[PDB]
Amino acid sequence: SLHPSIPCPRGHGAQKAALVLLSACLVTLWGLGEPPEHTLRYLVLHLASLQLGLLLNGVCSLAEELRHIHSRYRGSYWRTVRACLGCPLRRGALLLLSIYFYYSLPPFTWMLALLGLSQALNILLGLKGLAPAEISAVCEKGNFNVAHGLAWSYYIGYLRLILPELQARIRTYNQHYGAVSQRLYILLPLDCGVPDNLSMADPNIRFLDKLPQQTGDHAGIKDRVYSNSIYELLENGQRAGTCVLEYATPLQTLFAMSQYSQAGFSREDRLEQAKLFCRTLEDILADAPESQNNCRLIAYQEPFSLSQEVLRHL
Amino acid sequence: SLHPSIPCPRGHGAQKAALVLLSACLVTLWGLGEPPEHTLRYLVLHLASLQLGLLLNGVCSLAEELRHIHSRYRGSYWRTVRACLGCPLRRGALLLLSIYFYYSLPNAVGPPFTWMLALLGLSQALNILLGLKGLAPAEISAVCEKGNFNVAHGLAWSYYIGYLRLILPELQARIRTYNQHYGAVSQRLYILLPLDCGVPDNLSMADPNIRFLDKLPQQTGDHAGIKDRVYSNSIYELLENGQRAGTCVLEYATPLQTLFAMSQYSQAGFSREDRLEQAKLFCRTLEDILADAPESQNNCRLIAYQEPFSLSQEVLRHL
Amino acid sequence: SLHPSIPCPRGHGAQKAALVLLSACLVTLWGLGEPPEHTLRYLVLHLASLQLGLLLNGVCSLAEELRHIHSRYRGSYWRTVRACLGCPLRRGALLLLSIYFYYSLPNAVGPPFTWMLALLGLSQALNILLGLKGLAPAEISAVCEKGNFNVAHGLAWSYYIGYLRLILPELQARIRTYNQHYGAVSQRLYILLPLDCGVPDNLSMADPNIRFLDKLPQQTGDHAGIKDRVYSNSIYELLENGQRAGTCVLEYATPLQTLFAMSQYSQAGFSREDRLEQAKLFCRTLEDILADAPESQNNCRLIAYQEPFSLSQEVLRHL
Amino acid sequence: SLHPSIPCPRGHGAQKAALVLLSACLVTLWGLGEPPEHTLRYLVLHLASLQLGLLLNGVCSLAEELRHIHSRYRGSYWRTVRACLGCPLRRGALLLLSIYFYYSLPPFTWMLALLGLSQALNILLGLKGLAPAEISAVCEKGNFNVAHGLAWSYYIGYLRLILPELQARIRTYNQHYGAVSQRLYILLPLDCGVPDNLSMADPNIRFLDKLPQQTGDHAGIKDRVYSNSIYELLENGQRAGTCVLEYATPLQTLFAMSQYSQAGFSREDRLEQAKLFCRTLEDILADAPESQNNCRLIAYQEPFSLSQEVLRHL
Ligand SMILES: CC1(C)C(=O)N(Cc2c(F)cccc2Cl)c2cc(C(=O)NCc3c(F)cc(F)cc3F)ccc21
Ligand SMILES: CC1(C)C(=O)N(Cc2c(F)cccc2Cl)c2cc(C(=O)NCc3c(F)cc(F)cc3F)ccc21
Ligand SMILES: O=C(Nc1cc(F)c(F)cc1C(=O)O)c1ccc(-n2ccnc2)nn1
Ligand SMILES: O=C(Nc1cc(F)c(F)cc1C(=O)O)c1ccc(-n2ccnc2)nn1
Ligand SMILES: O=C(Nc1cc(F)c(F)cc1C(=O)O)c1ccc(-n2ccnc2)nn1
Ligand SMILES: O=C(Nc1cc(F)c(F)cc1C(=O)O)c1ccc(-n2ccnc2)nn1
């Protein structure tokens, strides 16, 4: 519910489609009025072909990966073989079953050579690639996303370091001094726009003062200084509200990555990873122990006044 | 060059192995003496069956990608179909070839076209439902490396852009000002890259031979909506047998500490093996960036090390 | 959307036409009713012959690319072979398939393997020597657009990086300083893009209704080894029936003037048709850059026009 | 002679290889001792098939380009057809000749349909692409290079306006002021690494003075000013030469383009276009009327002191 454009996690629509396809194929096989022992024989033979093709692809991948045995696989052949062929025991059982089914069910070495040729063509010309939807699904399942690491690092390195101390500093500033809200408002620009000043993003927002700076050592730096800025959110020139505004710096860096050529990062990838960053940041703040209603994410996309949105969240 | 354990980028060993396999298969087909027409016919029929299976798998995936059309594909069906089934025109041409060459060509090993379609749909549905069509870790790693689908890629580019790209231009001026106003501190930034991702908050606890000495002048600058953000780096000293061997500006790579924390947290879905791989990828990507970046022109150095030891000796060796 | 005559980027009409042609050819092959095995056999034989012709052409090209190995290919033969013949592994696999599927398969229309190779080498040599295997200007334009092999692409990116990326950040401050200390000058730099590339040195001669009014404060900055390079922009006023209708920071795009000069010079190898194509492409590329660039945010406006007229009326209309 | 790594223009090595291949093919046809009427028939049929395939490819390209008729082809169908099919008259003559030879020489519509299918596959899957060497040769022949336009624009827009009066400015400065050279030394770093100051590139080069600025209108800007800088060249810490040093700004922008992701410009392309820029700029200055031994290009590659190179060129 952060923003309507944020993608929801993938469910089981592909599984439902596969179930429907399985049902339809069973219905049409029954309706063909043709003996089912041949059906089972063909199905077993086809799965055997798929298993042997996977074996050959994994053997080629193993030939590639045996150079990285000391680097990625800590100098062990077993981990390399597991990486390139899945579980060795189950894969071996399936390959022996497939070999037996070919050598038993009614040539074989000719089919084996031709299947090896097909697998070689698949590897060399890239026939069996990966569609963008498949890559996205695999990355989201295995958390192989730039945004996942970026948002978890934003939470661990910054947010959990300040949030309770930030509430304490807000209380101290209020009692010393138009009270400021006791929460850090972090803006998430989905599409674009991450100026170094809130005034540049919107002149209606004006820097008011600075919170009592927090100085604590963090990752090899003695007395690291945190300086959070209070902003007045005005409305027709009057102080409608005031609170601690901030921008999610990993979003700025996602934009910068999309700018650089060496990053291998595209505008579509930039927007997608910004959406995932916001999604997983909200997801981990929901279950965070530090987040105790002392942090508010304001996700927005420019089609617009930021100050009105911040007041709406206030 | 940072560390021997950091893996080199993937080469073309798989393609060379595939070429050798193709040559062996061609030699075997020539030796067996089977008619070449049958060999070509069955090869084309196999490729057609694979293409039709890809069609069915793409349709099944489109069944679940169609409800993310507004959120992920800007509400356009063409982008969804392109993401699921690939390029619509090339995929359509390939499926037209597959249909024509299976409906027409004879097939002794394989059922007629309607029976083939039923059986291939059955097998593809089984593969999708049971998860039989899966990717081994090596293929997933290769795809992620080619497509930059790593947490380490983003983390290293973020360490560059968000932190290094800000202090590196002014670090030389700050060190010169410190030297003039007040041994001599080195002019290079020494980023420590522990491959074990053990990053103490206080660097003194890492090794007693490094003790905090002083602080560089604070660099005040606006950044991402924080007015007057303060960068207060630190100047440390290195002790050899208790004597002041050298001084430097030492710190750790914060993304490595966040990687370790992710490996600690359960919700992160991050494992120790994944932690080590992404630490090495972060180090490699940062090294490549600094090699290509114009800001780091003899201005920053990276200390990559693995605990099997004293950090002070390694830093002095790099001095 | 600058001008109607500026061409849109090339779409996929060729691929759609190819798909329609493929469908028609498949329908025709079904209609005649020749054995499908013969169809597949002859298609594979034709593709094999094409691949072997590509091999021969690549070898002939490698004969001339081998003497630029040190200058162009850093002295390594692998880059030369990759440039000439493509990817060595994929090309080798395709060549092995072609050789096997021609020497093995029967062929009623076509010679035996050695006779085919001799005749195909003869034909490829004839194509290379007589220049028969040439590219029509449409394919050359498509390849140049896809690969950014245009003078206009580099010229537009150079106008952005070398000039606009330097004055646009401080243009607002300069105009504000001028306004405070002195009608009111507009806050946007108006870059005129004449598609005829007629760029007068003195903009007054283009149309008398535009007249120079004053000069913005000089921007002094280092750039490309020129110490204290001075950008002295000028402001113009726009007249309507002799009255001061408006005032703005108006200037021309110098790369268009250089394009016109290239069309004038004989050694440039630049024609009037090429001049017009590259002018329109420069306008399109600059528009795309300014749309994507962060420097241009309500700071610069492009006035693209073609003489069939008064420039002042167009600039006022855009005002 | 500007730099050893500068590529020389492509010669006729491909033509010589084609001639050798033609000779070897003639020898082997004579060697097989097999009748030449069948040889001529096969050759004519092969060229006819190639011509028909080119016709089909051009028809597909015409279907693509017919929507750019008003933009690129001035709203005339004849220009679009010429662009997509070459010369209409010669192409038509060749197609009628090929059709007649294909039909007359001992099916036809079946072969035509199969050739159309092959051409459709070539277009859709991109079998008949363009190798990097072929693209480079075509671009060099047709001057479709970024560097060509960049260097011609550098000559016309900058050098053509300062070179005539640079000698007068230098003479005036020398009279008012230990003699500075009467040539503009332009540095051409093949790595496109240009600092904004010569001191940053090499601290042994120090800024000496400023030439009397040249003020003249240029391309819609009244009284555009040029401020050339005289630098100091030092050897062993003492003055050894004084000259007007400058960097080729198109090389700066080539580097910047290689940096930006939107440019579609790579590092290999950056180096190649830097080399072509230097080559064609040296070619332009060889016949430029303005260049009267009042301009010297300096090309170098960092494996080295720039000041020593400038002294060597002095
Ligand atoms: C390369 C070679 C000789 C080969 O090794 N196989 C594996 C294989 C089978 F797939 C099927 C039976 C035996 C073998 Cl032994 C193959 C298959 C075809 C073919 O027509 N497959 C259609 C097809 C099916 F037959 C069953 C099915 F469930 C789905 C399906 F889509 C053509 C050439 C080959
Ligand atoms: C698609 C289809 C049916 C077709 O339309 N042609 C055109 C054509 C010729 F190219 C050659 C002769 C007749 C026809 Cl009619 C074709 C050719 C082959 C083939 O085997 N070409 C080898 C080959 C040669 F025969 C002569 C040569 F100088 C070089 C060469 F490389 C296979 C299938 C076809
Ligand atoms: O790593 C840092 N920052 C970031 C890293 C990211 F990966 C990112 F995506 C965003 C940032 C960011 O903060 O902008 C960082 C490190 C040290 C200090 N520092 C040194 C002295 N005092 C403070 N400040 N920042
Ligand atoms: O994003 C930040 N940090 C990091 C983000 C990462 F993704 C990471 F991997 C490491 C860090 C890190 O520096 O520890 C960050 C943001 C704002 C401020 N801040 C606001 C006012 N004063 C200081 N400080 N740090
Ligand atoms: O177009 C310009 N420059 C360039 C264009 C390129 F395509 C390139 F490759 C490099 C340059 C460059 O000079 O750096 C340009 C235009 C106007 C003024 N100017 C405005 C007021 N006074 C002077 N100055 N420069
Ligand atoms: O490169 C320059 N100009 C251009 C280059 C182009 F490629 C182009 F298409 C247009 C121009 C142009 O501005 O006319 C240039 C370089 C140095 C100085 N300069 C040196 C001292 N003071 C001023 N002025 N101009």
Author numbering:
A (entry chain D), D (entry chain B): 5 to 110, 116 to 186, 192 to 317, 323 to 333
B (entry chain C), C (entry chain A): 5 to 186, 192 to 317, 323 to 333
Authors' own words:
STING plays essential roles coordinating innate immune responses to processes that range from pathogenic infection to genomic instability. Its adaptor function is activated by cyclic dinucleotide (CDN) secondary messengers originating from self (2’3’-cGAMP) or bacterial sources (3’3’-CDNs). Here, we explore the conformational and oligomeric states of full-length human STING in the presence of closed-LBD (SR-717) and open-LBD (diABZI-3) non-nucleotide agonists, lending insight into potentially distinct modes of activation.
We expressed and purified full-length human STING and incubated the protein with SR-717 and C5339, a TMD-binding allosteric ligand that has been that has been demonstrated to promote STING oligomerization. Local refinement using a mask around two adjacent STING dimers yielded a final reconstruction with a global resolution of 3.1 Å. Two copies of SR-717 are found in each orthosteric site in the LBD, with the ligands and surrounding protein displaying near two-fold symmetry. Overall, STING bound to SR-717 adopts the canonical closed position. The lid, comprised of two beta strands from either monomer, is fully ordered above the ligand binding pocket, allowing H232 and R238 to interact with SR-717. The SR-717 complex induced an angle of 26.4°.
